[PDB]
């Protein structure tokens, strides 16, 4: 099946998706450091951890965003 | 007057060339002290001098420094570095909260402060930012704290017990409001001993400082740290 | 066989700190080795230090 972006990761705590909105997505000017969730994303098997997360020893600020949606797929808030 | 008492040095005169460039005058010295203190004040007074410093900005609409607002004509980044270098004097306590509101085409001075009374503005024309539109207005709160030395904004972050909002940026805080010490050792006249010094010392500092209360700090700060030696177990 | 892209942008700022590389326009690299403090560094007649 198609894999999608969404809010919430299983087997996580409420803590980490508080830098992410609604959309999955890691809020602009959101700070932060390794290891934390930028875009949510779940692949299913009933679904795994497939998200995007900052690589180990990399930290910063979020500036941008930027999303590119296929013809015909609709298109998330943030888009 | 005899070989075992010394001559007490004292101040003498406080020269304010400026509201920041001040002189010290220290006499009298028996040979050799005025060298030893003079450099013994200046390394105290670069580096354990009390001020006070901005330490987190909160503009309106701006919620990272990497941005930019509609009108002004400076970058957050900018505008926080501009920020960085004004200087203010608190009185009471080592916290404060100022607010600044400003509209309409021109700069955007220190004098826009909203008044509090125990917050004085050493440099009220020290400008911020350039509103180049009208119907453009900018709303800030400018954390201030009093502290020493220079403390970036990961030291300070380290913490992250706060974990401030998207919107509160960390500006990296110089409390140090001394900028330049110079001392010059002389001959001084003291009825007929004919071997004494007096001392002169010329600060630059950014006005937020009295010299002789500097003096008196760095002279605290010696004796306290040497009370240890004095005690030595 | 991909329907979705979502790119983020982080920005960092990096200071001098020792071990980093640093040059003139002659040649003359060097590796900064130690930030000396502000009272430690030679000063000259008007206290002004380098």
Known sequence: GPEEITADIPNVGEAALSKLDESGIVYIGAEVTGGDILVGKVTPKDVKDSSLRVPNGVSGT?????????????????? | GSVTEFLKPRLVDIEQVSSTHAKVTLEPLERGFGH???????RILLSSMPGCAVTE?????VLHEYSTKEGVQEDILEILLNLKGLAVRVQGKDEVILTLNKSGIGPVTAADITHD??????????????LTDENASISMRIKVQRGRGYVPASTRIHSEEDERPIGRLLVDACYSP??????????ARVEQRT??????????????????????????????????????? | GVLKIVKVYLAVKRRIQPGDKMAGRHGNKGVISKINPIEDMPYDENGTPV
């Open chain 2, 36 to 42: 030893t203190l003079g450099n013994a004040l200046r």
């Open chain 2, 178 to 187: 001394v900028e330049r010490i110079a001392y010059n050792v002389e001959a």
């Open chain 1, 62 to 79: 979020v500036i941008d965003v930027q999303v590119f949606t296929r013809d015909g797929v609709e298109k998330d808030k943030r888009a």
């Open chain 2, 195 to 233: 071997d004494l010094d007096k001392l002169v010392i010329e600060m630059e500092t950014n006005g937020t400082i009295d010299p002789e209360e500097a003096i008196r700090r760095a002279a605290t700060i010696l004796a306290e740290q040497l009370e240890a030696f004095v005690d030595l177990r």
């Open chain 2, 57 to 61: 900005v909160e503009i309106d609409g």
């Open chain 2, 117 to 130: 009374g125990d917050v004085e503005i050493v440099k009220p024309q020290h400008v911020i930012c350039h």
